[PDB]
Amino acid sequence: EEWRGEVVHLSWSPRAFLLKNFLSDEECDYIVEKARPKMVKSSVVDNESGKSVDSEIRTSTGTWFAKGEDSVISKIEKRVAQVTMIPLENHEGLQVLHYHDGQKYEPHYDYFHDPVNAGPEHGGQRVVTMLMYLTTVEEGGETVLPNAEQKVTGDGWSECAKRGLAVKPIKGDALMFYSLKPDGSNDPASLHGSCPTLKGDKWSATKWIHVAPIGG
Ligand SMILES: O=C(O)c1ccnc(C(=O)O)c1
Ligand SMILES: [Zn+2]
Ligand SMILES: [Zn+2]
DSSP, rough: OOOOOOEEEEETTTTTEEETTOOOOHHHHHHHHHHHOOOOEOEEEEEETTTEOOOOSSEEEEOOTTTOOOOHHHHHHHHHHHHHHHGGGGGGGOEHHHHHHOOEEEEOOSSSSSSSSSSSOOOEEEEEEEEEESSSEEEEEOOOOOOESSOOOOEEEEEEGGSSSEEOOOOEEEEEEEEEOOOBBBBBBGGGGEEOOOESSEEEEEEEESSSSOOO
């Protein structure tokens, strides 16, 4: 339910907020261990040939959990609803990803479902995304926002990260960022990616949250 913790304001363009210690270590491990045997390489069906091929855009492995999948996930899902102030009926289920060994997600918008996403196709417009880091990544793996106002600088950031505002994955933290402005218009500043993971293993769980109930 209701969560009490440190929020770091990252940006107004796009609106981005870092929720410190949003998940416990135990919850992070639970999701990773539940997801692990289910992970498959990110793939899309190539239109021309009509064949399944590895995505060149999201090169992680991936899976999904249904909203309300089980009790432990359900609890987190209610917490996500509380901090975003948007009811559960508008939330997709968890998208779990694992990147390592150079794997990335090229910058894109979360405005709509993408064929690369594991799980069902949900029509509808996302307003907000929550990205929950399930592991701490030693090198690379930053979530980068290239159209943000203030780029990150200095040693300790991957070259990819220095192309925008960037967030280092730290176990238990969650990045909340808005794809739409408060008036429902698109925010082009919400372009975001996952910089290649260079050392370690990046596990993340994404919650995509719509302006209106999913389906139903
Ligand atoms: O894992 C990430 O950092 C990331 C970056 C951009 N997009 C997503 C997503 O799942 O939408 C996840
Ligand atoms: Zn995204
Ligand atoms: Zn690995």
